[PDB]
Amino acid sequence: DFPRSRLRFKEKLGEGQFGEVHLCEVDSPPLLVAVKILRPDATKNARNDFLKEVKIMSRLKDPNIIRLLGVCVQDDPLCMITDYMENGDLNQFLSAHQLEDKAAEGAPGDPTISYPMLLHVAAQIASGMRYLATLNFVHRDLATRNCLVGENFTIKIADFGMSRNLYAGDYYRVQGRAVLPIRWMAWECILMGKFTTASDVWAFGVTLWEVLMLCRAQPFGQLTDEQVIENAGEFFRDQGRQVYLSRPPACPQGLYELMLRCWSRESEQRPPFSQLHRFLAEDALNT
Numbered sequence: 324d325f326p327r328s329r330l331r332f333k334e335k336l337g338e339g340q341f342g343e344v345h346l347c348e349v350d351s352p353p354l355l356v357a358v359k360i361l362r363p364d365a366t367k368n369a370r371n372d373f374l375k376e377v378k379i380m381s382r383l384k385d386p387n388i389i390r391l392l393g394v395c396v397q398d399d400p401l402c403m404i405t406d407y408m409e410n411g412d413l414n415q416f417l418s419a420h421q422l423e424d425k426a427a428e429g430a431p432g433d434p435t436i437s438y439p440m441l442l443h444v445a446a447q448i449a450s451g452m453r454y455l456a457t458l459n460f461v462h463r464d465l466a467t468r469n470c471l472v473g474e475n476f477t478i479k480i481a482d483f484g485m486s487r488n489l490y491a492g493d494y495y496r497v498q499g500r501a502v503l504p505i506r507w508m509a510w511e512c513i514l515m516g517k518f519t520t521a522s523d524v525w526a527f528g529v530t531l532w533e534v535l536m537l538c539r540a541q542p543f544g545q546l547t548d549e550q551v552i553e554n555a556g557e558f559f560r561d562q563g564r565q566v567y568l569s570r571p572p573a574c575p576q577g578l579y580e581l582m583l584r585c586w587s588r589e590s591e592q593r594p595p596f597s598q599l600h601r602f603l604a605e606d607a608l609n610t
């Protein structure tokens with residue numbers, strides 16, 4: 324347990340599910356960490372959710388998953404301490420880049436990104452998801468808005484919840500029901516509301532689509548929420564009328580066919596993360 328008195332709060336980094344995240348400095352053995360604390364309006368229910376989030380995160384020990392560095396001492400107000408990811412949100416990060424025209428033509432720091440770097444980003448996500456699958460842990464909300472970027476394009480999977488204003492349009496809300504990220508959801512999750520490792524694979528396919536789009540458009544962006552939900556009914560009925568995300572400009576056909584396998588009607592035909600990682604790290608380099 325880490326004494327709260329060793330922390331110096333510096334700036335607000337954003338909201339989390341049941342708290343708010345601040346950049347902090349630590350003097351003891353100028354190190355920067357990210358610290359989540361309870362929101363100023365926190366109730367008994369928020370505190371309970373916060374304590375359970377600490378327990379969930381203590382399960383997670385992988386280079387491409389966020390890690391809990393410590394918690395505050397029992398007498399202190401509740402805090403969670405994690406790595407400060409210098410480049411922040413992956414969706415906002417990729418939105419600030421464009422695909423390079425000629426390979427290895429720019430100066431260091433140019434706002435461009437290469438096709439092999441897009442594969443490196445997606446491979447790291449697949450490796451973190453492979454790890455969660457070995458714990459039989461189901462994420463339930465994989466998307467670029469829930470991934471973080473550190474130095475040298477290192478990627479960690481995280482989970483900031485479904486209540487942030489910046490991504491409100493990514494969730495479907497009906498009074499009295501669970502909030503749903505429908506444009507990332509497998510057809511069986513839309514229809515029956517339960518989540519599995521195989522539906523995490525489907526969401527990974529959408530996340531991979533996002534990366535190759537450089538986060539320039541929402542999945543199914545020209546269709547309404549109601550049409551996205553009806554599309555799940557067309558997967559169920561299986562009469563060849565369902566529709567899929569289109570091939571991104573940066574995406575060659577061979578990689579697109581892997582994305583299409585993530586969206587198979589049958590869960591067992593979707594590729595495991597071990598095979599998705601191997602394609603992105605090796606086969607995708609082929610000409």
Ligand SMILES: Nc1ccc(C#Cc2cccc(C(=O)Nc3cccc(C(F)(F)F)c3)c2)cn1
Nearest residue numbers: 336344357359389405406407408411480481482
């Ligand atoms: N620049 C920046 C900006 C923000 C941050 C941060 C942060 C932070 C703090 C506390 C908890 C979590 C979190 O992801 N919780 C969480 C809950 C359930 C499941 C999972 C799972 F890992 F499985 F995805 C993760 C993130 C760092 N650096």
